[PDB]
Symmetry: C4
Subunit: 219 residues, 4 copies
């Protein structure tokens, strides 16, 4: 019976049937946004959802027989397994993010279509050649985040009171959003020289990011 | 008579005449901005406008005989067709953007001057090699927009109350404008962990956009 | 006497002397900023300043005898002429920006030092390959500035009331600065669909700009 | 005994022992952020710190015998030297940034690890090819800052009242942060034409900055 199911699974019909449910469930999930819609057709769509969730567990089960160990060493399959498993955890208990994380399944449209898969893989492949820069940065961030907390967190605890807060703030200085009027001009009312900490920080981090982009435009 | 008019249409004089009218009518449309000007020469210009509109329908009619089906397979001609058609709908009824859409005819300067066509065509040609990325993103936006509507739209309906609202907001976070002080620092006064949603969103979206630019700098 | 002066003008000592005054007069102009300094040594400075202006007119006079027509066909010499002429208009009357425009003579350090000249020239040379795009953009801006003036300038005259105002506003949207919370969200309180005008504008303008950067990386 | 120590110094154990202490001391400095932690285990960590500081001076001393003059011509060692010297200045007196500058020793992880050095060196090497541009900009900034101080610093002394103030403000305009709603729309309520100063400044400075990135993408 193995080859029987193995010919169903591997079939064009199967794959295209799954893709058909994804685009359907995805449309159905945008509709579950509308409180209007739900007051009318919410029963339809909760059951339709549980239906699709079964079909997807059935499918993921079949795919496991047909591939065995080959399956749990496939990134894309691992993804599908995990994303479906989230949708299995009862509509209750723990947190409610698990109810919301259900929408992550629409990423199956990426997993189950090679043109998407191509593009995604193309992107992700660029990551390993950045890890040296990324690591450099995280150290830099870590250092300055600590310095900031002990330079400004007493008078300015909203922003620098805690290591985490300094991280968040320093990230935001890095996107350059409201960094001057929102943060450094205020800081400078109390610490005239705070500009000596932030202008350099801005240069370094912006420099590094120019390099990282140009790095990727070599490979 | 076909070849008679075909020699008129194809003539350098004909084209340079049309181009001459565009620049004038374009100049005349920036004058129609001034309430001062309109109170003194408003009629001078409205008739000058109706004049140019006929001349352009006459031309488009002529250009059609000379080209027949070849015409409605030319992007640039199709454009001029649709744009002049807009200017034909009576100055009234329906919506009044149609009165405003009239200034789209100054894009005829692009269509009728070859150096412009080059650059426009240069630009547009870059789009197809972006479609797989652009599609990737749209799915991504779609998924996150839904996640935000159901995570922040009850307490924060201005910004996330509706699927489209979340779309607009997520775009603004992507342009990085007032994303922290405007949206996320606020959100975190109620949802301490909103940063776990928006930092990843900013990374992914910024990365993808760096790749797309680098992609273009390969092709 | 010609060759006598021609050997003085073309001398290393001459050039280095001029470069000396520039770096000196430039330091002088930053000190002229301090309200303190001026009460104390302001007179010292104004005479030293007029002295320098003489020397510079003498030089430019000499430089012309030694080059004649060749001089008024040199970009860099023309600049030096045009800048020194400005510093010649009495510190009185007309517009007083002329008193301010004087500091433009510190650009002579770019003109008199070759390494600078190289870099400037390197930059300027990139301009001609952008002119088709820069023209394209201006037309785009012109057309949209007009659409905006007649679409929002009645309720929003601060931002769109005039062709120029719309220009300025549209530029600011292009730098993406406070474009959503500062302008478009406001607009949308009255014109729910103003988003259909600004998102496309932002896409088009940012696309074009990515291309121009990549266009340069090609050339 | 020279070769005896030279074998200890050059030992993989020695170098890995140092890297081991850096990662601990770094972990320990993030815990020193928490006021809670300090009330409990603060005395633990002050000693642990002074311990490591001794060890690091011992190492730096040992490393000097083994390398002599070669050591004070090595960037990375010089650094290591200077960063520990800061950490030696008593926990008192002068300024107390010296207490804060102690966190710069975590940059020793960049020094002590070759994978990092590589990446850092890759970056720094790009600097020399930028100095002609950087010099140009600084001149440009200097000139404009002076032009701004004497154009807007009387009415707008918060932002342009001083040479330094103008510098900071001009920098902020250059990052394009809050530049229109925050600076130039205000300025223009009093100086209608202030736009004539800042739009060109934005163009020039953003142009140059595009080139600089592109320059690094050809080197
Ligand atoms: Ca902003
Ligand atoms: Ca604000």
């Amino acid at each position: 019976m193995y080859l029987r199911i193995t010919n169903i699974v591997e079939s064009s019909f199967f794959t295209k049937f799954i893709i058909y449910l994804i685009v359907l469930n995805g449309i159905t999930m945008g509709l579950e946004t509308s409180k209007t819609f739900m007051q009318s057709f919410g029963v339809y769509t909760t059951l339709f959802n549980q239906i699709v969730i079964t079909i997807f567990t059935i499918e993921i089960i079949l795919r496991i027989y047909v591939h065995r160990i080959s399956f749990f060493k496939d990134p894309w399959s691992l993804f599908d397994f995990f994303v479906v498993a989230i949708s299995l955890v009862p509509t209750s208990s723990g947190f409610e993010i698990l109810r919301v994380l259900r929408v992550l399944r629409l990423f199956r449209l990426v997993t189950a279509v090679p043109q998407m898969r191509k593009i995604v893989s193309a992107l992700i492949s660029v990551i390993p050649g950045m890890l040296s820069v990324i690591a450099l940065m995280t150290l830099f961030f870590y250092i300055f985040a600590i310095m900031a907390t002990q330079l400004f967190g007493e008078r300015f605890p909203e922003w620098f009171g805690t290591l985490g807060e300094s991280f968040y703030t320093l990230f935001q200085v890095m996107t350059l959003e409201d960094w001057s009027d929102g943060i450094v001009r205020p800081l400078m009312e109390v610490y005239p020289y705070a500009w000596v900490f932030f202008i350099p920080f801005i240069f370094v981090v912006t420099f590094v990011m120019i390099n990282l982009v140009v790095a990727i435009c070599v490979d």
